[PDB]
Write a structure and sequence with these properties.
The structure is cut from a larger assembly and holds four copies of chain A, one copy of chain B and three copies of chain E.
Chain A (H helix, E strand, L loop, with lengths): L11 E3 L4 E3 L5 E4 L6 E2 L8 H5 L9 E2 L11 E4 L6 E2 L6 E4 L2
Antiparallel strand pairs in A: 1-2, 3-8, 4-7, 5-6
Chain B lengths: L28 E2 L2 E3 L5 E4 L10
Chain E lengths: L18 E5 L11 E4 L6 E3 L8 E5 L9 E5 L2 E3 L13 H5 L7 E3 L1
Parallel strand pairs in E: 6-7
Antiparallel strand pairs in E: 1-5, 2-3, 2-4, 4-5
Classes of the chains: A mainly beta, B mainly beta, E mainly beta.
Subunit structure (chain H): Homomultimer. Interacts with FI protein.
Subcellular location (chain H): Virion; Host cytoplasm
Family (chain H): Belongs to the lambda phage major capsid protein family.
């Protein structure tokens, strides 16, 4: 659109039982592609992970099986997302109507 | 200094080589063997004589 | 434990179209959006 | 900017600019799951008969 | 021309689900995942009525009937609220949830 | 000057596992984390344990909640240390506090 | 969440030099730093400025002191800001509290 | 008993339990029964 790049986003996500678009009906965001964000991930609060030192990690697969008469294994994932931004004012949000 | 060569070679039973105090093995220390990042052995934890087991 | 993350966004940055002239009551043939684009982009603390 | 410092009076000392700090510490999520190997008796919707 | 294949997942949590055997004065046909209490007087085993408060003592594991002198039932663990059958007497969901309070049995 | 004494925080007292389960609860006020709980004889919901009724203590809460918290999570199993529990002040008898959780998978040391 | 912020403490307003003076103190309460002080009408001691007496405040305390402090040091010259110095709430008129230290070597900017 | 190291001085064993609150524990097993086969060799006097 001259200097500004135009996109149309339609991503969805599934809540408890139904789907829904990420965005509400009519939003308009002035943003800059060069603006720097942060994919920061905290320390995995897991003794097993700390046994071999994977404190700062993106994801953490983990599997174990219960002992005793009942036998059944699990799949475990751990992460501490803290998606952050550098400057808040560099983005402007407008709810159209 | 009573001999020309001061070096002496002693063979040691494997049972004398293990994790000290029978501690649990880790990623780098396994059965009393020190393993670097590249897998090369570094050190050995050897026990003294076990006879009598007393 | 419910926690919060308030970055410090200014009230200006999250301006909605509240009012009697947002986008729909405007004439579809004569009215332009470019003025709105400028009036919402000049207060963005940098090029967008 | 420079408003009106007159060369007869000393004037005033402009205070320095100080920043602000914030914390967003905690972070976490853990999607556990289960397989219950007793499920394996029945045929999957895959694996044609 | 549609037979769905729902994933049979009786379990609802990672806690182990241990079993136990006990004599049972059952007076009907009890399917699996059946709540049951301990008899007040005879101390036999019957299906939980849904009216007595907290009388339930476990969850039956393998279906049986009156003829079954002894029966096997779950003693620990957590199960879903839906897959477990309930006596028709129990109406409000709150007491159904709190039915096995103070015991190794819980529901979600 | 200001002497602060860091201390490690281990509510657990024994190697026994501590499974946690969720249930509706008619909590009255802001309940701090790890609070004794009881079951209401009438509303059939979960409230903070009075510290007076015997055997009514059902479990120990997991995460601090309030009256607006419909679902409350709480430990069902495990052993906990007496000094590291925020008991109601009503339970003024040490032995009663000790043996209150007797008969279930929650115990005290 | 907590916005503690960071501002550079600059109690001095203008480049006028600041001088200190040590005098016996008759404070009745624990006096924090940056407190106006007047002379007692009876014992000619130093008492934190109540805010109702006009122009009778003499000095501005530099280092926080208390009643047990026999004597104390106060600023006797310079220009200081308005928000920087803790002030009594009895005084309410903005212009009057601005001109409270008039006629002396202490100025409010 | 499985490892066949029942007779020893000290038995340290470190392991992490399963489950969601997976935590690690350490055990130090021993059975000291120190004795003396000549009790009358030693004489203890309580001074006064």
């Amino acid at each position: 659109y001259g200097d500004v790049a135009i996109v149309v986003y339609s991503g969805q996500y599934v809540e408890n039982g139904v789907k829904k678009n990420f965005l509400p009906d009519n939003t308009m965001v002035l943003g800059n592609t060069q603006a720097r964000g942060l994919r920061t991930y905290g320390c995995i609060q897991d003794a097993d992970a700390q046994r071999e030192g994977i404190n700062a990690s993106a994801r953490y697969p983990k599997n174990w099986v219960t002992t005793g008469d009942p036998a059944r294994e699990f799949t475990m994932i751990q992460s501490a997302p803290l998606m952050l931004l550098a400057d808040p004012d560099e983005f402007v949000s407008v709810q159209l109507a | 200094s009573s001999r020309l060569f001061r070096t002496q070679f002693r063979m040691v039973s494997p049972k004398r080589i293990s994790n000290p105090n029978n501690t649990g093995d880790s990623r780098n220390c396994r059965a009393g063997v020190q393993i670097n990042d590249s897998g090369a052995a570094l050190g050995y934890y050897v026990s003294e004589d076990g006879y009598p087991g007393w | 434990d419910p926690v919060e993350v308030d970055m410090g966004r200014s009230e200006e940055n999250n301006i909605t179209q509240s009012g009697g002239t947002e986008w729909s009551k405007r004439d579809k043939s004569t009215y332009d959006p470019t003025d709105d684009i400028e009036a919402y982009a000049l207060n963005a603390s940098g090029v967008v | 900017m420079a408003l009106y410092v007159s060369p007869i009076v000393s004037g005033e000392v402009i205070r320095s600019r100080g920043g602000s700090t914030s914390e967003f510490t905690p972070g976490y999520v853990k999607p556990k799951h289960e397989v219950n190997p007793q499920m394996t008796l029945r045929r999957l919707p895959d694996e044609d008969p | 021309s549609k037979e769905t294949f729902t994933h049979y997942q009786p379990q609802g949590n990672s806690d182990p689900a241990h079993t136990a055997t006990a004599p049972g004065g059952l007076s009907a046909k009890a399917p699996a995942m059946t709540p049951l209490m301990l008899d007040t007087s005879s101390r036999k085993l019957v299906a939980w009525d849904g009216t007595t408060d907290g009388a339930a003592v476990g969850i039956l594991a393998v279906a049986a009937d009156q003829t079954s002198t002894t029966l096997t039932f779950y003693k620990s663990g957590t199960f879903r609220y839906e897959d477990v059958l309930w006596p028709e007497a129990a109406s409000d969901e709150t007491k159904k949830r709190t039915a096995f309070a103070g015991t190794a049995i819980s529901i979600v």
